[PDB]
Amino acid sequence: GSLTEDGLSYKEKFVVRSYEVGSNKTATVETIANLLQEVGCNHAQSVGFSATTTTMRKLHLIWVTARMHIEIYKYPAWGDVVEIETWCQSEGRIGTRRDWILKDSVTGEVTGRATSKWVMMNQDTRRLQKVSDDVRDEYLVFCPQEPRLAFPEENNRSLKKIPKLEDPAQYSMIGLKPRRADLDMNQHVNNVTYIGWVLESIPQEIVDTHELQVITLDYRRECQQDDVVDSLTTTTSDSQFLHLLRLSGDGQEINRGTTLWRKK
Amino acid sequence: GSLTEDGLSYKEKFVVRSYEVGSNKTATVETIANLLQEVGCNHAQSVGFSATTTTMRKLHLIWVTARMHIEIYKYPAWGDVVEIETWCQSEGRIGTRRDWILKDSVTGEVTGRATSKWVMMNQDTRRLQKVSDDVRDEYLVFCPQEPRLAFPEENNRSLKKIPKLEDPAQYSMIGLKPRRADLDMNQHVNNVTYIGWVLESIPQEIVDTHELQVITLDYRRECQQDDVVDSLTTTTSNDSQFLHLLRLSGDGQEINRGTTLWRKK
Ligand SMILES: Cc1c([C@@H](C)NS(C)(=O)=O)cnn1C
Numbered sequence: 339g340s341l342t343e344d345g346l347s348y349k350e351k352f353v354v355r356s357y358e359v360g361s362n363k364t365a366t367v368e369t370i371a372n373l374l375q376e377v378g379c380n381h382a383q384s385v386g387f388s389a390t391t392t393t394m395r396k397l398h399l400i401w402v403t404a405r406m407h408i409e410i411y412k413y414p415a416w417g418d419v420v421e422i423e424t425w426c427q428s429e430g431r432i433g434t435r436r437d438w439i440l441k442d443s444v445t446g447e448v449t450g451r452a453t454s455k456w457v458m459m460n461q462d463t464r465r466l467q468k469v470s471d472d473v474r475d476e477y478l479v480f481c482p483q484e485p486r487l488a489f490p491e492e493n494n495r496s497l498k499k500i501p502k503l504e505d506p507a508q509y510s511m512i513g514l515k516p517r518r519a520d521l522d523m524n525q526h527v528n529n530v531t532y533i534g535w536v537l538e539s540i541p542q543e544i545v546d547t548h549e550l551q552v553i554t555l556d557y558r559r560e561c562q563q564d565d566v567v568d569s570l571t572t573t574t575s576d577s578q579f580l581h582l583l584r585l586s587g588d589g590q591e592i593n594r595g596t597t598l599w600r601k602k
Numbered sequence: 603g604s605l606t607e608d609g610l611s612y613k614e615k616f617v618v619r620s621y622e623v624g625s626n627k628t629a630t631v632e633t634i635a636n637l638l639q640e641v642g643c644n645h646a647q648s649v650g651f652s653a654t655t656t657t658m659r660k661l662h663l664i665w666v667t668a669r670m671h672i673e674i675y676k677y678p679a680w681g682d683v684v685e686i687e688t689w690c691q692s693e694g695r696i697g698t699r700r701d702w703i704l705k706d707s708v709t710g711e712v713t714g715r716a717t718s719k720w721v722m723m724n725q726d727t728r729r730l731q732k733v734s735d736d737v738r739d740e741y742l743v744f745c746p747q748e749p750r751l752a753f754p755e756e757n758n759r760s761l762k763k764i765p766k767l768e769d770p771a772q773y774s775m776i777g778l779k780p781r782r783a784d785l786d787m788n789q790h791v792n793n794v795t796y797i798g799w800v801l802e803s804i805p806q807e808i809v810d811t812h813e814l815q816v817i818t819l820d821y822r823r824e825c826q827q828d829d830v831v832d833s834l835t836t837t838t839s840n841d842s843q844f845l846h847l848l849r850l851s852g853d854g855q856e857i858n859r860g861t862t863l864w865r866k867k
């Protein structure tokens with residue numbers, strides 16, 4: 339991969355692997371989400387990050403995902419080459435945004451798009467905060483200054499408010515636990531695992547007859563390595579579902595989300 | 603990736619990804635196992651498969667792993683390029699063997715090696731069978747004829763018989779269940795998930811202070827999508843060795859047995 343000519347975005351090509359695909363021989367949404375993370379990490383490395391900035395390391399601050407929104411038009415098949423372009427933008431004092439565009443390397447057409455909202459947090463107390471001027475200055479140099487949105491449309495699915503699922507849920511998958519492969523290099527549960535857990539409560543018949551077109555996920559709290567999660571789903575409708583991940587015991591919310599599925 | 607000059611082996615280079623590494627910023631054994639399977643799949647595709655032969659498709663037969671043996675000297679770091687060479691060999695009527703050699707692309711040194719034993723099975727009845735001459739002639743043209751072993755040593759760990767762990771186990775991890783990401787393109791549990799489940803019963807302090815050097819796994823039965831597994835471990839030993847057992851949480855039916863060897867960091 340490499341930064342583009344202006345140095346304000348990053349591109350990388352990936353060849354879809356045999357273990358990365360599902361029953362239709364196309365990449366799962368989790369493989370797509372892993373690739374978005376990888377191109378994001380490669381972009382941060384290319385522009386000098388060790389994405390904590392110098393000031394963030396001094397004030398013990400980290401970026402945490404608040405929301406992830408993905409829309410897939412075509413899932414790349416096993417052996418296909420997908421090109422992903424990524425960029426970040428400052429959202430004033432609120433936080434930052436990272437966007438992605440997925441393209442078929444052979445045809446050049448857009449096969450998917452994603453957007454994510456990140457907020458600042460003290461890594462020890464876990465308390466959220468706004469973005470200060472000193473931190474905004476050291477990352478503005480890597481962002482386009484004029485707006486560049488993967489989801490430009492005025493009133494699109496990426497900015498919709500998600501309600502809290504009420505008991506009883508129509509479907510559920512209980513007792514979900516992360517294993518070591520679900521952890522990142524800092525021993526935290528990878529954000530992609532939560533996408534997997536959300537999908538676990540969708541019945542197999544829907545998965546077998548539909549393709550996931552849109553997924554919006556809100557992140558409220560982290561699941562620790564010794565935590566146990568319940569995944570809850572209710573049909574709200576194409577089929578649309580409302581989702582909720584909560585701790586098995588006290589019922590503490592960890593995530594909420596929505597999915598939109600198209601008939602094959 | 604590509605077949606080598608003689609067309610009897612296959613090589614592929616991989617750049618280690620951010621999500622593929624553990625706490626030390628080096629590839630986990632599961633990432634290594636996934637890469638071994640990807641290079642194996644790319645080798646089968648390059649020589650005309652889609653590794654079911656023409657006669658195998660006619661007799662409804664498939665290759666199934668009986669044993670996997672991996673030895674790692676150095677785990678590649680995040681961003682490093684690892685080159686993996688793979689080849690297959692006929693083992694007469696018993697089955698076939700697939701071997702791998704892992705190398706650091708920059709230094710050229712061997713950083714790991716793996717070997718695996720595969721047996722023929724009827725896809726529907728699940729009954730094992732020997733390799734017929736007709737099937738053997740369809741894949742011998744893709745194998746070196748003279749022996750080529752990743753583990754040549756006359757008394758090596760890859761061919762050791764593994765005993766069955768006796769209750770009570772020293773350590774355990776109960777109620778393990780596969781999710782959709784643990785399934786392959788045919789909706790079967792991926793073989794690499796079993797490596798993960800075996801490792802789950804190793805205490806975190808051993809993982810934090812040791813590096814996994816050798817893993818040998820015997821595959822006895824498949825875990826179905828609605829099955830629940832218990833992972834059991836007992837220390838058998840600067841080096842720590844463990845005996846492992848995966849069994850169904852209910853009836854206690856054996857699915858895998860294995861051994862691991864760990865070295866102090
Ligand atoms: C605290 C937290 C969040 C924030 C952004 N969600 S919240 C509480 O603001 O709704 C995301 N992950 N974690 C661990």
Ligand SMILES: Cc1c([C@@H](C)NS(C)(=O)=O)cnn1C
Pocket residue numbers: 666667668721730821822823824
């Ligand atoms: C049935 C099976 C085996 C065989 C080789 N083990 S066995 C029958 O010899 O105990 C390996 N994986 N699976 C699913």
